[PDB]
Every structure is written in C-alpha cells, then in structure tokens.
Amino acid sequence: FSCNVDGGSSIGAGTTSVYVNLDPVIQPGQNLVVDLSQHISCWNDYGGWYDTDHINLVQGSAFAGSLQSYKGSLYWNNVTYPFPLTTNTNVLDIGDKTPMPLPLKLYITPGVVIKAGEVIARIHMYKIATLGSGNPRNFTWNIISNNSVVMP
C-alpha cells in the first residue's frame, strides 16, 4: 500500500507534512474547509483487489497548538465525525492500482487565527491488508497552513 502528497514520491508509512492553502479572511460563524482529497492519494500496489487494503483514521487525531480550542469536523468516506477524533472512523477499502484521492475533508470553526507555517492538525491513518498478518502500517498527516487566517 502506498500514498503520495501532491503527486510526490510514494510513502509506505511515517509522518508527512501536507501543506494547504486556506481562505485568508474568515467570517465569525463560518467554517474553514480543508479539502485533503486534493492533496493525498493512495493505491494498492498489487492491484485487482487480490489483497485489499483496509484504511481508517485513528482515535486521538486532533488539532495542534492553539487550534485546540476550535470546533471541528472531519468527513471521511461518506461519514462526518466530530474532530478531534474520540473513536476510530469507518474503514475505506483500497484494492485498485490507480491512485485514489483520499475521501477526506476537515472543517474548522474558529486578529490572527491561523499562522502561516503552523501545524493545524495531526491526522493518524492506519492500514492493514487482508492476507496473513496484514502488514499493518501507521501514517501521520501533519496538516500545515501556507498562509495566515485572520478575522475582520
């Protein structure tokens, strides 16, 4: 099983930065939307569903730093969860060789409110395969803003 970030080289496990661009001014009341499906893609290395990969997001995935007082949600594979995650999410099954956008979005309801270069969130993803022990792997996606977000 493999993933990549913005069409970069493939990743089999570990921590990777995912740099995102946010709306630089946000109204009070309103969500910021981070669409990670436009950043992360993943695929099965053998293909054809012979040894399908089971992927879920893991309990404890959370905002970082001063974003921890903000409410949030996380959309994963057709289900909306409260963020930070207090449970694991449903499982997404990956069997195709064609890189698939991760069905993953993050909603954030907050002067400067996000700093350029600030870790916004730490999303732990788990993979296990179907055959044998399953060759379980852990991924962490550190989401980081390219730019400041301000309230007017």
Domains detected in the chain: 1-152 (2.60.40.1090)
DSSP E strand stretches across the chain: 2-5, 14-20, 32-35, 40-43, 53-57, 62-63, 71-76, 79-83, 92-94, 100-101, 104-109, 112-114, 119-129, 137-145, 149-150
Nearest to 1 by CA among 100, 94, 123: 94
Contact 40, 47 (CB under 8 A): no
Nearest to 109 by CA among 28, 36, 35, 37: 28
Taking the C-alpha atoms of residue 152 and residue 108, their distance in angstroms, rounded to an integer, is: 17
Experimentally, the structure was elucidated by X-ray
Phi-psi region of 122 (alpha: psi -120 to 50; beta: other; left: phi over 0): beta
Give residue for tokens 């399908």: 52
Nearest to 24 by CA among 116, 92, 102, 97: 116
